[PDB]
Amino acid sequence: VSPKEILNLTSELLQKCSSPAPGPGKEWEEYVQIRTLVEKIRKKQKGLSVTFDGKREDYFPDLMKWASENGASVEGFEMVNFKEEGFGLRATRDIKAEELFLWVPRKLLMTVESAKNSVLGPLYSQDRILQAMGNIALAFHLLCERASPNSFWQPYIQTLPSEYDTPLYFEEDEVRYLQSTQAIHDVFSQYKNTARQYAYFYKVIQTHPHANKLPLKDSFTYEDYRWAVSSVMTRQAQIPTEDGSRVTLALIPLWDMCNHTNGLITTGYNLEDDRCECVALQDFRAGEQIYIFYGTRSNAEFVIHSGFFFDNNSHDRVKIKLGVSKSDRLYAMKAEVLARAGIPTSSVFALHFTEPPISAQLLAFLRVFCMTEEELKEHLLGDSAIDRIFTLGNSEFPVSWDNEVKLWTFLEDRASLLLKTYKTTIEEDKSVLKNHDLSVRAKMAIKLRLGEKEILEKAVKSAAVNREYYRQQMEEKAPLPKYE
Amino acid sequence: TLKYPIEKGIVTNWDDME
Ligand SMILES: Nc1ncnc2c1ncn2[C@@H]1O[C@H](CSCC[C@H](N)C(=O)O)[C@@H](O)[C@H]1O
Numbered sequence A: 001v002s003p004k005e006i007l008n009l010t011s012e013l014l015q016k017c018s019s020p021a022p023g024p025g026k027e028w029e030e031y032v033q034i035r036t037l038v039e040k041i042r043k044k045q046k047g048l049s050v051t052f053d054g055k056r057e058d059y060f061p062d063l064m065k066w067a068s069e070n071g072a073s074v075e076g077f078e079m080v081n082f083k084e085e086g087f088g089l090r091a092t093r094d095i096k097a098e099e100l101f102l103w104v105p106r107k108l109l110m111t112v113e114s115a116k117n118s119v120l121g122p123l124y125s126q127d128r129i130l131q132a133m134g135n136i137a138l139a140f141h142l143l144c145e146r147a148s149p150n151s152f153w154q155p156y157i158q159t160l161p162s163e164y165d166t167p168l169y170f171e172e173d174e175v176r177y178l179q180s181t182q183a184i185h186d187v188f189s190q191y192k193n194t195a196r197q198y199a200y201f202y203k204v205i206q207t208h209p210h211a212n213k214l215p216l217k218d219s220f221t222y223e224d225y226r227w228a229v230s231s232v233m234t235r236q237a238q239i240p241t242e243d244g245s246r247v248t249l250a251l252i253p254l255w256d257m258c259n260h261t262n263g264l265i266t267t268g269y270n271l272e273d274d275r276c277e278c279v280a281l282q283d284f285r286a287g288e289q290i291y292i293f294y295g296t297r298s299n300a301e302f303v304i305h306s307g308f309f310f311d312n313n314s315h316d317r318v319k320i321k322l323g324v325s326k327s328d329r330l331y332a333m334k335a336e337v338l339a340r341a342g343i344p345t346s347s348v349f350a351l352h353f354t355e356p357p358i359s360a361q362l363l364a365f366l367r368v369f370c371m372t373e374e375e376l377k378e379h380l381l382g383d384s385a386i387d388r389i390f391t392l393g394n395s396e397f398p399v400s401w402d403n404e405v406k407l408w409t410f411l412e413d414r415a416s417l418l419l420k421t422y423k424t425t426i427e428e429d430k431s432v433l434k435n436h437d438l439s440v441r442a443k444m445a446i447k448l449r450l451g452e453k454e455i456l457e458k459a460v461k462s463a464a465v466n467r468e469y470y471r472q473q474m475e476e477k478a479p480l481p482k483y484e
Numbered sequence B: 001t002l003k004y005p006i007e008k009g010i011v012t013n014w015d016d017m018e
Helices: A003-018 A024-043 A060-069 A112-116 A121-126 A128-132 A134-146 A172-176 A184-207 A222-235 A299-306 A331-340 A360-369 A373-378 A385-390 A401-419 A426-435 A440-475
Strands: A077-082 A086-091 A100-105 A237-240 A247-251 A267-270 A275-279 A289-292 A317-323 A346-352
Touching: A003 A024, A003 A184, A024 A172, A024 A184, A024 A222, A077 A289, A112 A121, A112 A134, A112 A247, A121 A128, A128 A134, A134 A222, A134 A247, A172 A440, A184 A222, A184 A299, A222 A247, A222 A299, A237 A267, A299 A440, A317 A360, A317 A401, A317 A440, A331 A360, A331 A373, A346 A360, A346 A440, A360 A401, A401 A440, A426 A440
Parallel strands: none
Antiparallel strands: A077 A086, A086 A289, A100 A275, A237 A247, A267 A275, A317 A346
16 A cells, blocks of 8 residues: 555565575475565556556557558458457458568557657666666556557557466466476566566666656556566567668567467568568458468467467477486597587477477487497598588488487487376376366466477377387398488 | 568567576
8 A cells, every 4th residue: 555565565576586596396486475475566556557448449440540640551451359369350351362461660660769769768778677678678668658648659559458368467276287397487487587577677666766757657566567578578579670780679560460370471571661561371351360470489488478379389399408428438429529510419409299300400419319439430530421410410311220229219218208207197188178167378278288298299109100110120231321 | 581570479588687
């Protein structure tokens, strides 16, 4: 209730969220403690500082008029509230593939550069965090303009969602589904970053004289900051500056109403006309939702940064950490072969769900990881050594039949070991999804943990098929393919 | 292709201490 009480609570939140990492076995405990302090602050505040009287669809007409007055495309589509994705664009005429149907001039964008020239500018010029991280700078730009009734971007801000499905909005028990996964550490980090940043900037805005003119000084709630960073992370894009020599982060009105489907990037920046341009990803008949391809992200990144889980994401993947051990008697040769191949001795690789399960770099690493001393020598010495290194990432040219049997054996065993570190099985997750009635957010968490295991299980199965294939080649003593 | 391809919701680093 009291301004002094909020100051004390934010000071405590700042100290808590600035402490070092407690160790992976204590990150859940720290997460709940941070949540407890955040929810105590949030329940003593009044939600979003600025709210609007109308419904969301009441403001899209003004968004169109504003965009039209500044040279954007406003014909051929309409805004529709779709159940699956929320609001999106629907075609009102047939749109052919590769047709330029959407363009947005730079003047409509909210950018780090427009953040500098705004009321936030003076604080930006002094505070080191804002200068180093344009995404946070974008979030405060968005909040400041939201709190400014005469802002040029009011038609855009009034049509933004009021809530998101980033993990910042999850209940404790919805995040608890993610325990023992790879994704949950990033959920922890996002919550700790956001809480730290809110507390830091709350204290800055209240005392730093360069924030004297900020509209946020009257009211700056945790809900404000959660909304602003979720708005930015689910919608921001990278574009070039007007000159084209640097890049910057931006919010792109109208275009950012398109929801996601599998495909290719069809949005580019036109520097000569200074506008964002989007060509149709596929044919869209009148009455069909207009989709774009957001980018080649994993489902962990879609959930955590984009606020949704995407079924049949063809680019999904999980991390796998591998390294040559310094206690290997062949460490020095293996490290040198990898170095000549441009591969580190230790790294985090990816496993993919689509074919093939492992990339050229991971294949090259696994081959060297399993090489005998005589194979390593042939990759280090003589007039063919460079040629041998060049084909290390190529599935068609193995080092030896036994080298392939060994690396696929190791991978099968490693992916099976990783599968055993999860708190549930694939069969159990599928039963929960079938026999429990769940919120959207809980389903996102369960499908994310299920998706991790399904990638691991498919790597297990593909490695076993590869192992048995190359074992047959070894038994038959078949001739090794040679590159020419 | 695209000289300046635009990725919607591009992943950025929010760790102000890193
Ligand atoms: N294929 C998809 N499935 C589910 N939600 C999706 C989606 N593509 C986009 N979204 C949603 O749209 C957001 C990106 S901005 C796109 C417009 C948004 N639906 C709105 O109402 O403003 C994501 O955070 C997610 O909430």
